[PDB]
């Protein structure tokens, strides 16, 4: 999902590449370092956002996400969720989902 | 603003939280089965309860999103399972007492045993003890002692525990707006929301009953042939138009007749196909057994196995220090982690079982891209059906000669294949009557059509009419036959085995039409053919996200189950059995009994 004019959860709600982006991409398997026995929750992500992030925009706001019109006020409940979610990391996970 | 947006939001966050707890719950069971330790036994309960209570907590929020305002089919299917409250609908007492009955009935099954009448000191448990002895036992009294005495302390003692299981489970179906508990299992086939593909729950009783009528002419000939070979042993108790004893079926419950293949061999003067002696000379181990099967899925176009799959496999049991269950099982946890726990010896069955155990893993790879709640087979019969089509292709002499197991000069003719069809017929044609018989009985008892006193009266009354089996010793309503069965005592679906036979054969006939194979069906081999894999891969990745009636049309082109592929694959055997039964009477009568003369 990382590329000019892409879509998806991580692209829209986390990191997006503008259509004119001239840079490059590099990735390698971290399963031998990040992933450990029992799981590593230190690496999280933003699951829900009221809209799509703009090009080269970073928002760390932890404010609760409101799905409907039901007030939240920072208290989890019906139609109220916590946007940040932790990536499950263990060495037994499939290569496709390896960090 | 609309409930649709709120429903999809609840479903997106549910897959992530459920995938983490579900993976840890299944991972805990893996370490418990691979190694028996005090730490793994507790981890399975903690991880199992954490995931079990997760659905109970999510079910409360799932009932707050009615499905009437959701116009998406994929959204309602995900919430269809979450809308169910499980045991929450039951009363506090009925909810807690239900687990006690399941654990009590399951404990007596494993702890149940029958002491040797001749050796009161030695007392052998049913599994393996009672299941192994009854397999090769040719004695009339030896088989009757363990078969008759088991249900005395089991069937009779499990009757009060089974009665509660019937009343408790019914309260759950009524709270779910189901006609009865019997309709609860039929809900797996329920199809609604698509015009023209709708499948009613009650339609299953008519399909299973309508398709069984066409199997009668094939089973009647197969039953008359088995009774002719065994008629010389006991002509008094075995009548020509009567039924065969219930304890002579070859095992405890008479589920599979494969054990009788030895004495039922039509031709003993010709060799049989076996890879045991061939693999020994080739010097192959469990490491190369799975590797040879992995190349088979690649020939049809299916992706290979991940590196972690073959590295984490368990090829044997390292003694009693670290012990595991040798029962072949395909464990799918999540996050791309696939493993198989089996004890791998050198045999012709392990090679065929390798393709079956790998079929489940290969089947889980197609729909793995679907949501957590959308990852599953279209029904309960497609799980083991997709794995049987792979084993049927390996048992063909063409596939064995390809890799070099069977000699290239081996003569293949009618005498050679006729003996092979009989071996597969006992395991296939033998389970069908027993499956429709036992499954139909549970639906009648749960529906309330059979009073408590007629449970056993209707059990054997319908047994001679369906499978044509009579009881040597008459039993009263105290005994419970299904109570001793594994699936009946463990609260598992017993109907999935009947439909598996019709589904595995439909794909066999459809996949062979894409590969353009000619000749008999049992001669077909899907290896080296990449056209059949592309057609089956479409449905493999669909899972239960789409109605099984629609997905089945894209493969075999049928909207329901059909027995036609059952007659063609068994056609060569039916033509031969019809001639051998001319001197005997085809069929049986329900008015004959071994104790009634």
Curated annotation (Swiss-Prot), chain A:
Changing residue 69 to N: In strain: 20A.EU2, Iota/B.1.526, Omicron/BA.1, Omicron/BA.2, Omicron/BA.2.12.1, Omicron/BA.2.75, Omicron/BA.4, Omicron/BA.5, Omicron/BQ.1.1, Omicron/XBB.1.5, Omicron/EG.5.1. Changing residue 37 to P: In strain: Omicron/XBB.1.5, Omicron/EG.5.1. Changing residue 85 to Y: Reduced host ACE2-binding affinity in vitro. Residues 47-82 are annotated as: Disordered. Changing residue 70 to K: In strain: Delta/B.1.617.2, Omicron/BA.1, Omicron/BA.2, Omicron/BA.2.12.1, Omicron/BA.2.75, Omicron/BA.4, Omicron/BA.5, Omicron/BQ.1.1, Omicron/XBB.1.5, Omicron/EG.5.1. Changing residue 85 to N: Reduced host ACE2-binding affinity in vitro. Changing residue 38 to S: In strain: Omicron/BA.1, Omicron/BA.2.75, Omicron/XBB.1.5, Omicron/EG.5.1. Changing residue 9 to N: In strain: Beta/B.1.351, Omicron/BA.1, Omicron/BA.2, Omicron/BA.2.12.1, Omicron/BA.2.75, Omicron/BA.4, Omicron/BA.5, Omicron/BQ.1.1, Omicron/XBB.1.5, Omicron/EG.5.1; May enhance affinity to human ACE2 receptor. This is Spike protein S1. It comes from Severe acute respiratory syndrome coronavirus 2 (2019-nCoV). The chain holds residues 409 to 507 of 1273 of the full protein.
From Swiss-Prot, chain B:
Glycans are attached at residues 35, 72, 85, 304, 414, 528. GO terms for biological process: angiotensin maturation; angiotensin-mediated drinking behavior; blood vessel diameter maintenance; entry receptor-mediated virion attachment to host cell; maternal process involved in female pregnancy; membrane fusion; negative regulation of ERK1 and ERK2 cascade; negative regulation of smooth muscle cell proliferation. Changing residue 23 to R: Increases slightly the interaction with RBD domain of SARS-CoV-2 spike protein. Its EC number is 3.4.17.23, 3.4.17.-. Residues 1-589 form the Peptidase M2 domain. Residues 12-23, 64-66, 335-339 are annotated as: Interaction with SARS-CoV spike glycoprotein. Changing residue 7 to V: Increases slightly the interaction with RBD domain of SARS-CoV-2 spike protein. Its cofactor is Zn(2+); chloride. Keywords: Carboxypeptidase, Cell membrane, Cell projection, Chloride, Cytoplasm, Disulfide bond, Glycoprotein, Host cell receptor for virus entry, Host-virus interaction, Hydrolase, Isopeptide bond, Membrane, Metal-binding, Metalloprotease, Phosphoprotein, Protease, Receptor, Secreted, Signal, Transmembrane, Transmembrane helix, Ubl conjugation, Zinc. Its main location: membrane. Residues 1-597 are extracellular. Zn(2+) binds at residues 356, 360, 384. It is found in: Cell membrane; Cytoplasm; Cell projection, Cilium; Apical cell membrane. Changing residue 9 to Y: Increases slightly the interaction with RBD domain of SARS-CoV-2 spike protein. In sACE2.v2.2; increases interaction with RBD domain of SARS-CoV-2 spike protein. Disulfide bonds join 115-123, 326-343, 512-524. Belongs to the peptidase M2 family. This is Angiotensin-converting enzyme 2. The chain holds residues 19 to 615 of 805 of the full protein.
